[PDB]
Amino acid sequence: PDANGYYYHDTFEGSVGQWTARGPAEVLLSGRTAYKGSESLLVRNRTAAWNGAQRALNPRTFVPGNTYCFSVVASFIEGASSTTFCMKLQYVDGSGTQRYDTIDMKTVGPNQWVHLYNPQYRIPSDATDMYVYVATADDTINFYIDEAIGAVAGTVI
Numbered sequence: 001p002d003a004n005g006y007y008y009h010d011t012f013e014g015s016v017g018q019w020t021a022r023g024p025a026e027v028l029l030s031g032r033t034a035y036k037g038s039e040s041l042l043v044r045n046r047t048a049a050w051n052g053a054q055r056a057l058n059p060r061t062f063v064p065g066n067t068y069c070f071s072v073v074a075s076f077i078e079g080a081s082s083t084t085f086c087m088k089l090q091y092v093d094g095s096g097t098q099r100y101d102t103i104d105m106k107t108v109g110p111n112q113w114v115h116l117y118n119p120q121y122r123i124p125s126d127a128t129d130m131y132v133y134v135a136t137a138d139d140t141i142n143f144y145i146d147e148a149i150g151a152v153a154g155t156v157i
């Protein structure tokens with residue numbers, strides 16, 4: 001928990017951190033557009049809306065039943081006239097069933113960064129094998145994320 005209450009903070013300025021592809025997509029650093037610095041994380045090769053970018057959450061830091069802050073900014077340049085970005089928690093519940101709970105969602109047009117943000121998100125008490133992820137609702141556009149943050153509940157960004 002750094003000086004600003006962040007547990008992780010991905011600027012994507014030289015490193016993808018713990019971010020990986022969700023589904024058969026691919027993620028990589030890109031200098032084509034950025035929210036801060038000169039880079040962001042590009043997400044491409046998606047073949048279904050559920051494909052995207054994900055990051056495993058360590059249960060020792062993000063304790064189920066506890067409340068935390070999550071933040072990311074996203075944008076796209078082409079492929080659609082608008083999209084709906086979703087930041088979500090993928091997890092396995094107490095019955096062994098994989099669940100998808102929405103943290104934040106925002107609709108936006110091309111060439112505009114949008115702030116996916118929830119300073120008061122409660123992780124379900126029974127969650128295991130957790131991942132925070134970003135995808136869209138119903139398209140397969142390439143998209144970019146930047147400034148990916150996991151923080152203490154109440155953290156203003």
Ligand SMILES: [Ca+2]
Binds near residue numbers: 011034035036039147
């Ligand atoms: Ca950046």
